[PDB]
Amino acid sequence: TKEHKDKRQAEILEAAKTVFKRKGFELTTMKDVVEESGFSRGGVYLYFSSTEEMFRRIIETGLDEGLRKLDKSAEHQSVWASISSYLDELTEGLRDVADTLAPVQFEYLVTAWRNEERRQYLEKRYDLFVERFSRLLQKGIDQGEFQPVQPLATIAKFFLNMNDGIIQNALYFDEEKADVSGLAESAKLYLKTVLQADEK
Template identity: 25%
Template sequence: MPKVSEAYKKEKKKKLIQAAKTVFIRKGYVQTSMQDIMNEAGISRGAMYSYFDNIDHLFMEVLKEDDYDNMQFFEASDDELLWPQLKQWFEMQQEAIENTHQSLVQAKAEFFLSSNYVKHAEDFPYISQRYNEMTRLIEEVLNWGVYKKEFQLQQPADTIARYIISFINGLMLDTFQLGNEQTKVKEQLSILLFSLENIVCPHAADKE
């Protein structure tokens, strides 16, 4: 049997993660099986299990990939004002939460509410890591805004970052359970932005 290169394995794994993401978006976390993903990817059971141990392992990899794209947004540009960038990020969150059929919101909500995660949270260290990493990234943007004299924070940066994450996560779960018409995602995020504007205090020239 010819030896498979590391580059090939890395690319193959990436394609499997993308196939899994497609299925998780379509079916959610609870209804998705390893067989569903094998069918989507057109791969054998043996090949699939050579990359991933089980559905939870695979979902964590999908989550990491999705988080990477999200976190890349916080690589703030030195040449751009930070407040408009933050508002753009909230617009992205709104779109994802409102359009659950086109995002991982349903799968994420089902996973976090699943008995397996609730009972064995310690088996999923990445969940804590992603929270800490997202907190750090938002905190860095806020502190960078202070350094550039764009922001005048009224609360500690890490507290503001945790407030944002808790709000978004809570809105995501509520909208999954109750629907956008009841949770009014756009209106709630508008209020969040209003409150943040008073907490972050971007200069008037930076608000447009």
């Protein structure tokens, strides 16, 4: 029964998130999560067979929710306004990134260069982002907002790189040095230029 299932899964994954943050990805076990969740062992192993399945689930849900937020916002304002609002939100949303799973996730992704199955998983998620973000940009073209001077897939990939760089800056440096606000303004300038967006 989907909504019942979705809530139990969300609960198990919140417990897992808590353990992953505290212990890291590698040292976290099924028992740790089962204890932290307050559910029975069979209630957890119903929906998940391993911590790695859980870890990937959390990554996917975060990517999906971010794209959901962009898509929905673009049902209620311009595509350009939805993308700009995402970038403006970054200074405020990244204040306590070090206490989220972001760093544990970046460490997990970095070792994919020497683990082919993991690399292929990453690439699939990469591909999905490029496709979804390209589709958002195309909506903007269809609504007459944009006349891009580069391919949509290139713009999407560049966007992912600037976005990931901004998150990384907030993680590694104090606020003034990270300059999230200035990097987001630079990203906006790039997007406005490459998309020929004329909304202001």
